[PDB]
Amino acid sequence: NTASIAQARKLVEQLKMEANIDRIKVSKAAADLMAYCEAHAKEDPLLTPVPASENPFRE
C-alpha cells in the first residue's frame, strides 16, 4: 500500500508544476503557426512542385 502512496505524491507534485505555467491565448498561438507557414511557403517543394533540372529524383 505504501508504494501507491509515494506514487500519488509524485502525481500531485507533478500537477502543481504543470499548473503554474504561463499560457498565451489560442488566437495568438494560432496566428503564429499560420504566419510561419506563410513566411516559408516558397521554400517547400512539396507545396510548389519544382520543375526538372533541379529535382534530384526525376530522370
Binding site: 491565448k25 489560442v26 488566437s27 494560432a30 496566428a31 503557426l33 499560420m34
Partner: peptide
C-alpha cells in the same frame, strides 16, 4: 486555465 485561453480556434482564424 486552458478554457480561459481558448478564446478562438485555429479553424476560425485560418
Amino acid at each position: 486555465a486552458r478554457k480561459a485561453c481558448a478564446d478562438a480556434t485555429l479553424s476560425q482564424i485560418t
